[PDB]
Ligand binder design. Sequence first.
Ligand SMILES: C=CCO[C@]1(C(=O)O)C[C@@H](O[C@]2(C(=O)O)C[C@@H](O)[C@@H](O)[C@@H]([C@H](O)CO)O2)[C@@H](O)[C@@H]([C@H](O)CO)O1
Ligand SMILES: [Zn+2]
Ligand SMILES: [Zn+2]
Lengths: 217, 220
Amino acid sequence: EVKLVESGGGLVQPGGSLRLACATSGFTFTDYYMSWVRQPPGKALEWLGFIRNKAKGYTTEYSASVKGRFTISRDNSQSSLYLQMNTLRAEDSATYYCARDHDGYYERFAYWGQGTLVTVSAAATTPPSVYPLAPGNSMVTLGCLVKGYFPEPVTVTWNSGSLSTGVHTFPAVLSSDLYTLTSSVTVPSKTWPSETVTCNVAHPASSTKVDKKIVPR
Amino acid sequence: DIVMTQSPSSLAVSAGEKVTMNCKSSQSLLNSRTRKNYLAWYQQKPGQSPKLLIYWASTRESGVPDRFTGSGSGTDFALTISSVQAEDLAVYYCKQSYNLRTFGGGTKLEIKRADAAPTVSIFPPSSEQLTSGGASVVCFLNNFYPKDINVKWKIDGSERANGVLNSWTDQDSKDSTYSMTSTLTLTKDEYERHNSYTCEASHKTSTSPIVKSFNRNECX
Ligand SMILES: C=CCO[C@]1(C(=O)O)C[C@@H](O[C@]2(C(=O)O)C[C@@H](O)[C@@H](O)[C@@H]([C@H](O)CO)O2)[C@@H](O)[C@@H]([C@H](O)CO)O1
Ligand SMILES: [Zn+2]
Ligand SMILES: [Zn+2]
């Protein structure tokens, strides 16, 4: 199957540089143009540039917004794609996606990566504090509070992802240069506390991995 | 130098109803040589990557439901959903590839459903947090509609507005409801000076507020 995976995202100081990578598999890489697209949190997609395929000599083109500042390259020996970003500023804070572009016939971005989040800021990396949210009657709702971290993102799963439905993870809110979010999960009263419920939190920027078991007070 | 504009910016439609969204280009996208319009539509569900729905204006990508139809030519295009489903909640983007590529600004599609009252849950601070000198009280207001809702916090019966942060989820793709979290943060010192902590939710679904409370003396 076709796979596209971005990496290299994270925190970078205003004025600094950062290079993203996009690893692909499951298709003849050299046949395809490849594009980079970005998206500031809550805003529209923006096309940044592409690098053409073999038939077209692997030449590059850029949007006016980034031409002269961002550089796209590819490694055809490893089927990977790169975006070099220079002189970063706040407007560059965004999720960056690589996408499989033109193959000489089709006009479509048929495949996209999961994207990688870039934050341009002078604020320091801070790992989250993670606190269990236990109650105090048919369904029971539990939660985890993920407080005081920077930058985004963090991920919250429940029971290593085996608890999927009945979960709500609330968008982080920034206050005083630190983010806070929470996640709720609602399970049958019979399953808890008789069975264990655990939230798993990860904060990539600080390599933080946290398991917090929700125990009755 | 091709400007892409979409309308509406947003709208909401009930399940089963028709929807039309429009995409305008500042110049024709009709490639005279290949006889095709270089215009594609993408769907981005909450928290997901964009997914291809339509390309060449009207060609539906395999695996994309028949209810999605792309139409139009030249400078004007549309995406029509014949019978909206709850899972169709998303931002829809058009994109020209006639000259490099350019995305429109997007159309946010939300789903209209029957009003639903929130399920409210309150949670006292954890001992770990208190030990560290902080005190967060959390209230979840889950699965309600419409999105507009009010929360007020009461400490020993008196309202407090300071130190409260609110966060709504995007609409749910299966039941079309919204949820919200309200978090009241206090110092431990201040937290320990009062007993009753109350989270009050007022929503159009009732003239009586939904109230959840805990007393510190009862062990949070
Ligand atoms: C006379 C047109 C020739 O177009 C091609 C060709 O070989 O048919 C393809 C062109 O492709 C691009 C490009 O700029 O690389 C990307 C495509 O996705 C599309 O945007 C087209 C656009 O419709 C214009 O044709 O351009 C391009 O490679 C072109 C020449 O190599 C450079 O003009 O050749
Ligand atoms: Zn060129
Ligand atoms: Zn739910």
